[PDB]
Amino acid sequence: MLIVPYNLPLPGGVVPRMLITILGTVKPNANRIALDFQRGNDVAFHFNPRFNENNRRVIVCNTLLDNNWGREERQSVFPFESGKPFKIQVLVEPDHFKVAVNDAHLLQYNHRVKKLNEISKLGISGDIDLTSASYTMI
Ligand SMILES: CC(=O)N[C@H]1[C@H](O[C@H]2[C@@H](O)[C@@H](CO)O[C@@H](O[C@H]3[C@H](O)[C@@H](O)[C@H](O)O[C@@H]3CO)[C@@H]2O)O[C@H](CO)[C@@H](O[C@@H]2O[C@H](CO)[C@H](O)[C@H](O)[C@H]2O)[C@@H]1O
Numbered sequence: 746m747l748i749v750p751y752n753l754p755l756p757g758g759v760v761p762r763m764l765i766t767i768l769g770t771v772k773p774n775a776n777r778i779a780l781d782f783q784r785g786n787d788v789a790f791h792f793n794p795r796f797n798e799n800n801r802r803v804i805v806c807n808t809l810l811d812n813n814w815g816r817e818e819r820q821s822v823f824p825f826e827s828g829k830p831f832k833i834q835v836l837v838e839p840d841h842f843k844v845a846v847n848d849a850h851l852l853q854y855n856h857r858v859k860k861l862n863e864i865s866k867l868g869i870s871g872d873i874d875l876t877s878a879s880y881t882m883i
């Protein structure tokens with residue numbers, strides 16, 4: 746069981762056909778989870794399940810550039826459940842990150858950061874027991 750927050754190096758950044766797989770279990774009474782794909786200090790792709798934003802569950806995605814958040818993209822489909830094991834798969838495609846949870850497609854997030862080969866860390870944080878984090882080329 747990995748320590749959270751957890752940093753997964755992505756050597757040489759990301760590239761299309763790279764698949765990143767995160768396995769974990771959501772804590773009971775979770776508040777948040779975040780996956781941050783980072784280019785140095787910038788966050789190219791922030792993937793942020795929120796379990797109680799005004800008593801609603803929502804996924805917030807965004808990009809942080811020079812310490813400024815951009816326009817949020819919001820998804821009301823919410824596949825996570827407190828207490829339950831999950832699998833997040835992030836497939837890098839040419840124009841977007843494609844995210845599936847528990848083998849069901851969830852969302853896509855268009856690339857705002859263009860230097861994909863400089864997105865060289867994944868930060869995993871929030872209210873989970875983290876089991877594993879890895880990548881493979883498909
Ligand atoms: C307070 C908090 O949760 N801070 C987090 C940071 O959250 C921010 C992020 O989710 C952005 C995405 O757009 O939204 C921010 O909230 C906005 C509301 O959505 C919006 O309705 C309102 O008008 O404006 C709000 C603020 O703009 C939200 O605060 O997310 C970052 C990245 O995950 C967190 O930083 C990381 O924290 C981890 C540990 O959790 C480590 O410290 C990492 O090093 C660090 O990058 C930040 O803590």
Ligand SMILES: [Cl-]
Pocket residue numbers: 857858859860
């Ligand atoms: Cl860029």
